[PDB]
Symmetry: C2
Subunit: 438 residues, 2 copies
């Protein structure tokens, strides 16, 4: 299988050329062109006068790309499908993507940017914009070479809130995110140091002493945040090690305890209050329902779902998250798809999806909530999984390989970004486009 | 590897459920009366545990629930039905454990696990919405775990729509739903209309596109069995097969190209001879599988046209020209590849994802009790099955909780459930008919 390109340094965002296209009458092309100008990449365009004019109006020099050239490779191909007004115009997807379908580089990106169907002004456009997800999921399974494929839906009028999502998907940070739908909504545009998009912020990560939580802590700290590493007192040694490695601090408590939210707020006060909380703490107690003990049902629901509800409730009602704050939860593919032996775990992780979906409308003060839903992630404890599930999870995705802890951490860090003001209520799988789903 | 079990399918209108039903409910549930009324109507052996409130609500509607000894690990139940609407928060999700763990080995072969809750978007508290959302994770795991051909569903009832549950619960209790598992079905508020449950399409006229063979032919048979007069539509090239199918079911024929600009005109003109059109099933569809880099322009266009745009044009005509009678039905056909994507199917999957959008964004603007829903079939054995390699066809056979491919009748039964005169509160749903295929989004 392919070695996936992953994050090296803040610049360049994209190594290689980017080809941009757009359907007639699109409305997102200026916004796309601005991001491309912002990240200083070699950007090419085909014979599209309106698109060339939209890019010139924001200062992007688009080199024309010779439709007769079947040899040039592009690291990313980006298509503004917002102009597709009905199902007949879905052939704008073919017109752009068929000529370059062999010319996307290894570890490359296919990115389609459309209008959120629920916000489209006509039913015919909503239908066509909905169709885009079918297209990109098929592209994600067909192009190989470690290429990812995404659809970004931009709510009608939210073109200004797209930059942080476009940057994440264009970059190697998104190496294990493929086949997914991301929704961008209207929000304030905030200033941000794109090289340190968590600069000046304080984050708290539960389950931080090891594993994916430790990787989350590293990436948040890399992006500028002071990271409060949270785990049970029994892990104090690993907690100190992680906090020292990243220049953070520790809070050694049981996240499920009644006073967890209060102790989190208290500890964050010393750093100017809490900006980001990542609910990564979580366990599996895999048993068939017929063999499962009651306490093992309760335990899994408690740690994976109810404890996060209690902490969120406390912080949101008692001034425990700063303005433009961030809640990031961790669901799972099994929350979406179910799994034998996981009636308790899948119930909890589906609850997490509901926690995100029904909390996001009621949030105030620019706070957002989102979740990652990892597929098969390689950990130092992965060899403890029975071999059958283990090798299936490793292979049954478009990347033909397991993901890495850093792939989940990067996606969480994109949610946490100071610039991701208009990313709210999303659940984004980090699964290399696993075949599993709903 | 094991061999699959045989799935029980429809044999006759009664009994709805062959065997006993165990009912349970969480404390403070609000759907138990409606459920108990259905179990009464179908004259089924119904049992209950130590739930006084449930026994009393069932006694109110004339249903006598027999106590099920909680020490009895041997009795088998064809169906277990749990009212989860009383689960108010995540801590109360252990009500699922309390009911299902003691009986997890006592669901019969080809049995039914049915969880009924409150539509999360209609729940009055955020905590309840979260808990009701959690039920989908639970039932999807049950569907993969219980084996023995057992299906598992969650039916969500909009707050206040309890009286609209009956046709869905009957479909799920019955063998008609043999190949539907892992799915979420939303019931919304609507008027309740009289129906003959043995002939739930009595007096109605249906039109089925692509009716001359395959799943289209199976659809035509099931709709006619339920009492509909079926107009079988296909291209004039299939006139002989069309006449064969129409003669077998007592229907009529309409030989046109569904993509033609006047197709909706000719459909309405044809249905005039039978009292107007009540039901249209958009089953016509094609695949033209090619990698995108190898695909020809016309082969993208053709797949979008037949599978999506043609249904849009016909719907538009019928809805703008009163071509569908009140309490009418539009049933579309998507596909697992429309949900999940597939190599070689950028055109097909785009078109079938569009069908999902057609359903979702037409449903809110329908009037006069007309509904629109879609089925999304997984691996269904047909004659167009030999085209795909025996290897890839082996993948589709195994990669689902039933460990087998479905039959055309399983798709037709789900379409017939949507089309039922009684399914007034079933609107905007896309229901996979896949035996809980592993594939998804």
């Amino acid at each position: 299988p392919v070695v996936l390109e992953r994050f090296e340094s803040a610049q360049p965002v994209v190594k290689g050329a980017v080809l941009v296209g757009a359907a007639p009458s699109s409305v997102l092309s200026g916004a796309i062109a601005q991001v491309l100008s912002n990240i200083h990449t070699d950007s090419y365009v085909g014979n599209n006068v309106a698109l060339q004019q939209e890019a010139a109006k924001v200062g992007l020099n688009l080199r024309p790309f010779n439709a007769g050239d079947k040899e040039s490779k592009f690291k990313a191909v980006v298509f503004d499908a917002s102009g597709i007004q009905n199902s007949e115009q879905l052939n704008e997807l073919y017109k752009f993507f068929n000529p370059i379908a062999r010319q996307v580089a290894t570890s490359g990106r296919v990115i389609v940017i459309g209008t959120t169907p629920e916000t489209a002004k006509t039913v015919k456009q909503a239908i066509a914009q909905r169709a885009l997800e079918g297209f990109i999921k098929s592209v994600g399974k067909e192009f190989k070479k470690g290429i990812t494929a995404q659809v970004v839906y931009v709510d009608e009028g939210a073109a200004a809130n797209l930059e942080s999502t476009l940057r994440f998907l264009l970059s190697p940070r998104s190496a294990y995110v493929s086949g997914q739908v991301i929704r961008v909504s209207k929000a304030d545009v905030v200033d941000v140091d794109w090289a340190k998009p968590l600069a000046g912020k304080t984050a708290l990560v539960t389950g931080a002493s090891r594993g994916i939580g430790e990787a989350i802590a590293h990436v948040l700290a890399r992006d500028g945040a002071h990271v409060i590493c949270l785990d049970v007192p029994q892990q104090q040694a690993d907690l100190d090690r992680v906090a020292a490695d990243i220049g953070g601090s520790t809070l050694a408590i049981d996240i499920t305890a009644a006073d967890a939210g209060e102790k989190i707020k208290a500890a964050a006060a010393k750093q100017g209050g809490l900006d980001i909380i990542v609910h990564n703490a979580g366990i599996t107690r895999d048993k068939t329902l017929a063999n499962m003990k009651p306490e093992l049902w309760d335990l899994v629901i408690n740690i994976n779902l109810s404890a996060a509800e209690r902490v969120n409730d406390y912080l949101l009602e008692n001034d425990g998250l700063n303005a433009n704050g961030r809640i990031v939860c961790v669901s799972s593919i099994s929350g979406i798809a179910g799994n034998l032996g996981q009636t308790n775990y899948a119930a909890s992780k589906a609850g997490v999806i509901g926690l995100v979906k029904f909390t996001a409308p009621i949030l105030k003060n620019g706070i957002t909530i989102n979740a990652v839903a990892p597929g098969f992630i390689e950990t130092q404890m992965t060899a403890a999984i029975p071999f059958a599930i283990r090798e299936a999870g490793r292979r049954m995705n478009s990347m033909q390989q397991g993901g890495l802890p850093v792939d989940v951490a990067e996606t969480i860090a994109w949610f946490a970004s100071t610039a991701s003001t208009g990313v709210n209520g999303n659940v984004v799988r980090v699964c290399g486009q696993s075949l599993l789903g709903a």
